[PDB]
Amino acid sequence: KIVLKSSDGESFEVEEAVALESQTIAHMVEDDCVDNGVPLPNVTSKILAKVIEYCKRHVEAAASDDDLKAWDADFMKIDQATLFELILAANYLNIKNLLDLTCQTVADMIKGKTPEEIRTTFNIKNDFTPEEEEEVRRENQWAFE
Amino acid sequence: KIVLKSSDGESFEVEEAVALESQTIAHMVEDDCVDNGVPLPNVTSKILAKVIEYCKRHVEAAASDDDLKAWDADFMKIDQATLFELILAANYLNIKNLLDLTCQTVADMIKGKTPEEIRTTFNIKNDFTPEEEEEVRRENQWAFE
Amino acid sequence: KIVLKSSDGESFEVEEAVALESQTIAHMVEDDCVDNGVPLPNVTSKILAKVIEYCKRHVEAAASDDDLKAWDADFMKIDQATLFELILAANYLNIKNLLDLTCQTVADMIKGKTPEEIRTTFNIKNDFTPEEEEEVRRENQWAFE
Amino acid sequence: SCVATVDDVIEQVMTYITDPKDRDSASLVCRRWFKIDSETREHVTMALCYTATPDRLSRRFPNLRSLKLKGKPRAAMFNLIPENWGGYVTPWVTEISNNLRQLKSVHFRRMIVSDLDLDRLAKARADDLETLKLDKCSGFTTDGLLSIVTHCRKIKTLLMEESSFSEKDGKWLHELAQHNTSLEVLNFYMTEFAKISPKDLETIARNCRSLVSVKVGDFEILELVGFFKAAANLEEFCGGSLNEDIGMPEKYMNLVFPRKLCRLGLSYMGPNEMPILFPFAAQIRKLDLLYALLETEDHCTLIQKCPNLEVLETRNVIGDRGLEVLAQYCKQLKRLRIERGADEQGMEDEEGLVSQRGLIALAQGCQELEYMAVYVSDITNESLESIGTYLKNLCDFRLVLLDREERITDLPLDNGVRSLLIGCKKLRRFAFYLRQGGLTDLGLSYIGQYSPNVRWMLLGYVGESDEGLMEFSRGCPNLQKLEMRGCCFSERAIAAAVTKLPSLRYLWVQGYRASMTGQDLMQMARPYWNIELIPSRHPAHILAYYSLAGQRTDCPTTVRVLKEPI
Amino acid sequence: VTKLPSLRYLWVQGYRASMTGQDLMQMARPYWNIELIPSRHPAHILAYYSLAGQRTDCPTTVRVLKEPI
Amino acid sequence: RRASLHRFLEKRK
Numbered sequence A, B, C: 001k002i003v004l005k006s007s008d009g010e011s012f013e014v015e016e017a018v019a020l021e022s023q024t025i026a027h028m029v030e031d032d033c034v035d036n037g038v039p040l041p042n043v044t045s046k047i048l049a050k051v052i053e054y055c056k057r058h059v060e061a062a063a064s065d066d067d068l069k070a071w072d073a074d075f076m077k078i079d080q081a082t083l084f085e086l087i088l089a090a091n092y093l094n095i096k097n098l099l100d101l102t103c104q105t106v107a108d109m110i111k112g113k114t115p116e117e118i119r120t121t122f123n124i125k126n127d128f129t130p131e132e133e134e135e136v137r138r139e140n141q142w143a144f145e
Numbered sequence D: 001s002c003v004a005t006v007d008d009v010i011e012q013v014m015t016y017i018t019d020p021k022d023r024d025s026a027s028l029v030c031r032r033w034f035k036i037d038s039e040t041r042e043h044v045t046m047a048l049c050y051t052a053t054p055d056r057l058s059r060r061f062p063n064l065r066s067l068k069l070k071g072k073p074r075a076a077m078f079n080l081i082p083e084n085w086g087g088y089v090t091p092w093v094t095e096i097s098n099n100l101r102q103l104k105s106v107h108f109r110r111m112i113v114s115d116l117d118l119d120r121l122a123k124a125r126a127d128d129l130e131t132l133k134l135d136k137c138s139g140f141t142t143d144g145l146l147s148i149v150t151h152c153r154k155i156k157t158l159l160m161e162e163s164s165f166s167e168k169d170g171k172w173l174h175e176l177a178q179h180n181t182s183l184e185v186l187n188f189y190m191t192e193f194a195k196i197s198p199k200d201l202e203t204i205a206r207n208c209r210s211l212v213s214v215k216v217g218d219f220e221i222l223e224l225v226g227f228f229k230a231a232a233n234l235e236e237f238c239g240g241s242l243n244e245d246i247g248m249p250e251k252y253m254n255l256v257f258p259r260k261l262c263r264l265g266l267s268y269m270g271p272n273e274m275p276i277l278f279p280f281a282a283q284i285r286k287l288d289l290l291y292a293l294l295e296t297e298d299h300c301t302l303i304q305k306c307p308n309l310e311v312l313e314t315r316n317v318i319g320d321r322g323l324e325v326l327a328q329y330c331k332q333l334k335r336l337r338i339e340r341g342a343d344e345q346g347m348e349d350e351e352g353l354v355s356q357r358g359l360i361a362l363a364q365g366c367q368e369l370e371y372m373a374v375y376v377s378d379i380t381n382e383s384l385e386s387i388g389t390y391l392k393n394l395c396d397f398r399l400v401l402l403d404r405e406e407r408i409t410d411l412p413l414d415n416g417v418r419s420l421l422i423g424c425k426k427l428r429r430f431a432f433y434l435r436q437g438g439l440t441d442l443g444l445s446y447i448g449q450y451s452p453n454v455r456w457m458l459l460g461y462v463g464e465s466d467e468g469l470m471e472f473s474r475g476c477p478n479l480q481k482l483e484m485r486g487c488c489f490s491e492r493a494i495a496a497a498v499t500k501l502p503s504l505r506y507l508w509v510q511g512y513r514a515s516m517t518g519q520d521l522m523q524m525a526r527p528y529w530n531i532e533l534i535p536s537r538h539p540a541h542i543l544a545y546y547s548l549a550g551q552r553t554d555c556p557t558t559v560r561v562l563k564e565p566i
Numbered sequence E: 001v002t003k004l005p006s007l008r009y010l011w012v013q014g015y016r017a018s019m020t021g022q023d024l025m026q027m028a029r030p031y032w033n034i035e036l037i038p039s040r041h042p043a044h045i046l047a048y049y050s051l052a053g054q055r056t057d058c059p060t061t062v063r064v065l066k067e068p069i
Numbered sequence F: 001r002r003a004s005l006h007r008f009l010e011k012r013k
Ligand SMILES: CC[C@@H]1C[C@@H]2C(=O)CC[C@@H]2[C@@H](C(=O)N[C@@]2(C(=O)O)C[C@@H]2CC)C1
Pocket: D074, D075, D078, D080, D338, D373, D374, D375, D398, D399, D400, D431, D433, D458, D483, D485, F001
């Protein structure tokens, strides 16, 4: 049992092998700061909660796949701002299952969309001068790839 | 009574008017994050301790000077690396008594010394080309000040 | 304990923090003339006594308001010539508190009165040519304020 | 988080080092401290404007808040330096326009300042100019003053003391009166203004709540009565004119002086008007009787009433009698200057001579003295000895013996100078101006031997031969500026002494065994060392100083720059 | 060394030394490099003007003399 | 002969 202290003073009681999914929390039982609980003040408490939920479930691949892509897909039914905070969090800790998976999840949102549809569904302002847009479009369609 | 959470998960029970010496901890009872204790993850727990000690004593100028310059001088009988960490901390919080005092304490180490004595007692490598050193020395003695 | 020498050779034994209510007497413990007592020969001894009485009582806001506006109001039950000499004295020393009461007392005499009633109750000769008075009256009633 | 270094904290700490000499060292510990000092230095003084180009100044210290430049040599205050010699302020104000965009205060001392250069300063700096000091400057007019008071609407301190300019009108004062609110100190102490109105000055007092100091020309004090009532916070006043007429026996007597006035000097004040000071004399900490019309007796009676006097300036009329009075009534005295009086028809009276008697009295009474400058009618080795024994922490001591008296008690002063220099070991500035017999080569060497802290020296008629200059020259570890006039020493001796002096950066000499050759001074040609001659059109002068800039472009015809073989 | 107008190189072996060291210092000028080869033969003094500052590449047998130790 | 007292020594007489 290990204590994780969120970025707004919020202790979290979590099991051994759950907290170890994060190689950042694992490389931190060497110089064990665990004496006062692992201080991670870059994860919101709301987010850290969601991270632990994910790790909890994946560790329960002890009883040994089909139902996982189900829970995972349902886990991702969140909003953008929260999806992005998870990515930042998986990177801050070091949860590769949460990185080759969160990054792939965002990439799956881009795949197939057009440039307009992309900045639509991410709310991004097209800041190209029309000359720039044209050069890039020409390069893309006449020359490269 | 307010809780200060150090940068390694270390709760600190401290009085009202003591924690208020820091305008950083004071401007933080408006949007009161105090709900979970004030999260200040940039001060080592060893340092924060020393900061609170200083504030504790100065607030006891309620019973109303001579003995203060005594405690203060004795409080500063520390090592360089620690003196510097106090400065950084007084700046991080916002304790003008402790910044006008730590900065003044480091300045008192420079005052009167020669350029050699200075980098001696701070271990700083003289990286001037001899031309540079000469121009600066000439400016200083022939022209400016 | 500090000595204040009035403008008719009259030593006054007064406490530390009492004499310090005057920033004029305070900025005079730097270049400490206190060696021979602070020489202030522009305050009558009768007046300086009243000044000290005021400072004495206000410094006893150590034991921490309602009863002060009472003593203050009763302190101002004096005659004009004496009120004025207090103002001049509060300005000579530098007692910001003391001046806010005497000055306000004089101002309360003016408030509500007409220009005739004012010079009546202060014995002031109206020295306006009738053109001047008229311009001023027109400006005041037709244009400004 | 790694071990915190000084480097993580030096940007911050640097701004708590205030002493110019500690900034000096700090700037030399390494490239980074150099840069931090460069960007945070607030004030710089240049003792000689020709020592570096303005470009150099603003590259080294781009964020100056306060600048002070001196131009003409000190000797200029004694009509010894040609008017056109130099000290033109104009390249400096153009540099200020372009590159010292933070400057809030400028002090020009002994410089040539034109209307064009002050118009440019005013427009460039405008509301940011909090303080301007035209201190013993020349070359401008009231048009310039008007320009700065209309464009710099927030001037706190404006000074023109002893400057000479052309007075075309009084609208500058009027312009201040009408719009200025912020004035704290206004100073035209030693100046001819005949077109300004005392009403304007009064109205300034009424509008400037923080007005603390004003010094003025020949205004009738009676005309300033309104001013005095309005200047509630006035602490200092000098100037005005006290003009008695037998008609009104009590012309004055009814002056309301601001209750705080404690630093003052009323010009032309006689014995009959003197008493208006008695009511608050216990309060007076600074006295300027330099332009007073009172006699040695009258001095004693006034001095006697000022127990808290710490600064006194006066003419030698003070007499030995006056010094005796000062000796026991004013124990707190820190600075005393005894200028020389009307020295033509008797010493103003038959007590207006100060001597061994006064000096020794003074030494015993006023032991707190930090600055003492005295024109003395007669000295003795004994008096110097007592100065040295009693008044330590003297920082600046100047003695000139008048040429009036024929016989001087005991003359060769060697043993006196020697104990003086030995007792007063805090001494930074030292002037000693005598008559030929005054000091021997042995004494001259004493001066060089026992003055480890002296940065500046003015030497009068000292020594007997080159032997003395040379013996002197092996001392003075810290002599930076050396002024000598009326000495015998030869060209090659001057040159050789300059070579020996470790710290010397400025030399001014009048009177020396010359030689049309010229070529003997050349034996001190170093790099960066500028030597200028002002030919014997008064005896030849030598001016020499280090400069990073090279030879000045702007020499008059009266000044010849000495370069290698003609 | 101070008196000699043109001197730019000095090598000296055998001289009344002093562990103090601090007497050689009275010739410390800018650009003037003084090197000691200690008495491991009698102490040598090598001194020369240089626009470059103190060599980076001294052996252990060679001590560079700088202001107060 | 200082330039401030040379002005005075004459405004005196
Ligand atoms: C080039 C020298 C001038 C020469 C002038 C000369 O004739 C004698 C002195 C005067 C000079 C002098 O400065 N006098 C004193 C002073 O501060 O005014 C120092 C004396 C004060 C007590 C300067």
